[PDB]
Design a binder for this molecule. Structure first.
Ligand SMILES: CCS(=O)(=O)c1ccc(CC(=O)Nc2ccc(C(C)(C)C(=O)Nc3ccccc3)cc2)cc1
Length: 230
């Protein structure tokens, strides 16, 4: 893999992320002053846990759909067998969402974009799972503070997804080769942008898995068997 191949692969992954990022970064940041009022917050707190889990699942499933599309545009991804595609997506899509969603987090007032406005962790009271939400907010606070560029998000989320250690993979060696090229690209690009300092600051990969797994443990009771097309 020449300089040209790596630098192509960078530009390419950043293309596919931009065409699938769901909400423009620009819009997210401008909407930061649009904050839920105390009345609006109380409205969400009073909702049943069934309705809140349903709404949140719906928004997560939409976010996953845009991640499927991102994966469908990674060159390498389609070359894999139907089984591994599904395996990487089942395991990975939600972890990508978690990373992506840090774009919708405002560290100044500890709020997240949700149904057209910004609100704090208190919006989600009715869900019951306060430890989890706090962990998600702490994680996002942490990721927020190192100012991931959009291309950094693209390169990083591509590696979140293209992970050769996922159990169930039938063509593991192929995923490794692809994981390896995405690593060269990420590192290459960090080098050119003088951003190599973020590497030691990234979360451990087991952290994404655990937050997303903890999530699904407290969601299992309300939602399972989600249709999600490829
Ligand atoms: C993700 C792409 S994006 O364009 O940046 C974006 C699109 C749409 C939205 C609006 C939007 O769905 N907000 C939203 C949705 C859910 C949650 C909660 C309920 C806390 C949640 O469960 N978060 C979570 C995320 C990943 C993994 C596990 C849990 C909080 C906020 C926000 C950001």
């Amino acid at each position: 893999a020449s300089l040209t191949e790596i630098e192509h692969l960078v530009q390419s992954v950043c293309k596919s992320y931009r065409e699938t990022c769901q909400l423009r970064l620009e819009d997210l940041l401008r909407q930061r002053s649009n904050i839920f009022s105390r009345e609006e917050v109380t409205g969400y707190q009073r909702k049943s846990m069934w309705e809140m889990w349903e709404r949140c699942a719906h928004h997560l499933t939409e976010a996953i759909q845009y991640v499927v599309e991102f994966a469908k545009r990674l060159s390498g991804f389609m070359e894999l067998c139907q089984n591994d595609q599904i395996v990487l997506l089942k395991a990975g899509a939600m972890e990508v969402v978690l990373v992506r969603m840090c774009r919708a987090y405002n560290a100044d007032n500890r709020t997240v974009f949700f149904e057209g406005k910004y609100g704090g962790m208190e919006l989600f009271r009715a869900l019951g799972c306060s430890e989890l939400i706090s962990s998600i907010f702490d994680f996002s606070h942490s990721l927020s503070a190192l100012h991931f560029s959009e291309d950094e998000i693209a390169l990083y989320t591509a590696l979140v997804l293209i992970n050769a250690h996922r159990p169930g993979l039938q063509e593991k060696r192929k995923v490794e080769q692809l994981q390896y090229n995405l690593e060269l690209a990420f590192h290459h690009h960090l080098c050119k942008t003088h951003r190599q300092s973020i590497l030691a600051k990234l979360p451990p990969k087991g952290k994404l898995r655990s937050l997303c797994s903890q999530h699904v443990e407290r969601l299992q009771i309300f939602q399972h068997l989600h249709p999600i097309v490829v």
